[PDB]
Amino acid sequence: GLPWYRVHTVLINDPGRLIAAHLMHTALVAGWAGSMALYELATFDPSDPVLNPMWRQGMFVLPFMARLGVTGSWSGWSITGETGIDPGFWSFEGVALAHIVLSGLLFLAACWHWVYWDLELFRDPRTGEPALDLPKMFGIHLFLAGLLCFGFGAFHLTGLFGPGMWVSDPYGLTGSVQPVAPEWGPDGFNPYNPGGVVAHHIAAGIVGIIAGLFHILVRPPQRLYKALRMGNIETVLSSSIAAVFFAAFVVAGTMWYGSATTPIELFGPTRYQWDSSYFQQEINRRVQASLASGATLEEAWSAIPEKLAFYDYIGNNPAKGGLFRTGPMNKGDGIAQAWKGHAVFRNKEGEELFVRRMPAFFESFPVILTDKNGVVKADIPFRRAESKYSFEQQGVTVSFYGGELNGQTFTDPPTVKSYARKAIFGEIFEFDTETLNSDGIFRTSPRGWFTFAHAVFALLFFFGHIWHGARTLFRDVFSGIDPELSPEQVEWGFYQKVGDVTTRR
Amino acid sequence: EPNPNRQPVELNRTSLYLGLLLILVLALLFSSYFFN
Amino acid sequence: MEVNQLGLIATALFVLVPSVFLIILYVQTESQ
């Protein structure tokens, strides 16, 4: 009988039950969405979008509802921190329930199509055999796709009839859902320009409508029909898989590098913002401005928003996790409570020293303090007996500006080293490790997990493409080669052109 | 030299439904006590 | 709630093991 890895081939010539199976799959996916959202809602803490945003909590579908304009709960909270709000029916809960109802309705439709598989629609009128006109189906479906793509850009994203999409400033401080105007010039291809996302869906949507109309009205050329086996639904599977793995690689890359569709308030910072000290430069810029206008050190650092300081911390860097370190980032370093303040180190002669920051590659990193010119002035030594740069010998002290510890200085060497070990991670925070029994080991963000899963699926779907493409082009020998294959046909020089019996010599 | 005493076993679909119902309802009853 | 952690696996196996037994018997009844 059929081997276990071929059971679903019984659908290849059964359009009705093919539709039934596809309905069942669609029911299961929508049901997952509903279930996942409800789970996230039952576990989400909305009380601090500054130091406990969704992406510190292991939220995965919540950011995707928020990205397109769903921002509040029937319980009265919203993800931007606003309180006493009425989101209407399209709250997180209502989106979840819509997907569960959709899943139930698809399930019932699947039953009907499985039972009533023998629909005359599926039969070729001339030959009475089941047949699908795949070229025209493609045109119909493409036209539909074009209409939705256009509608989604023209109405939802613009706010013409819809909410807009998540947009924010360059440092992820003031994000919100806002209507977005199309960017029609060359900056529309800038991945960080939200207006280009609007123009893309309007432009491509029209192209899809036009191409849809073309593919409904114009038959494929005979040369192309035969070359691509357009009478064989498995050629569609092969090329659909190729399109899908291509799309999967693109969304993995834009998640990892960042774009206007992967904002940092929904998914967390990228690793490159750590590599380039992106938030630290902005922080220093603001402090220098406060210092330029005559504010004191304490005032300049106290003006630094905690949200910005929390971005300048390697624990939110997505390249710091591990494959089997599970759960939300809060399970690792803990639930962030407060910015402790900016630590300033000085040696016995009053030079400001700078802790060398941990690079993402390193699970552990030594504690090395440098001056403005990069000359090493203090460290925590491994071998003590020939130490020249100990905190004890160099009289290193730490003072804090802004934050919880503002205006405090510590001089006892073990406390000073303790903060120096934290400073290799960037800005220093007070964490609650008891509530979640946090184990102290960095985990990755939803940006990291999403990228991993989609790059791995994309690679595996490459093999699916190769497999089903091979099966499409080599259908005739799937079960084996011709038992009467002529030895003159595979030996050399019998034919002028390989495999062409009309070129015999 | 096969054994003459062998017999096929049967479970009809109705018995499967009844049996699945017994197990699920027993699980629903005792699960609270298992979690305690 | 501070429930017994082994209650999940106990419940899970309570369902799975006898259910699988019945399913095995039923499917082989159908194929003969």
């Binding site: - | 679909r13 109705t14 119902l21 629903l28 699960s31 609270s32 | 369902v15």
Partner: peptide, 30 residues
Amino acid sequence: METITYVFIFACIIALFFFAIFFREPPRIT
């Protein structure tokens, strides 16, 4: 986890109701 377990079991039972009714062995006059 316990809430999920109770609801999972309850949901399987409703699914069983559907099959027991609509996919029964039909009673035939034999």
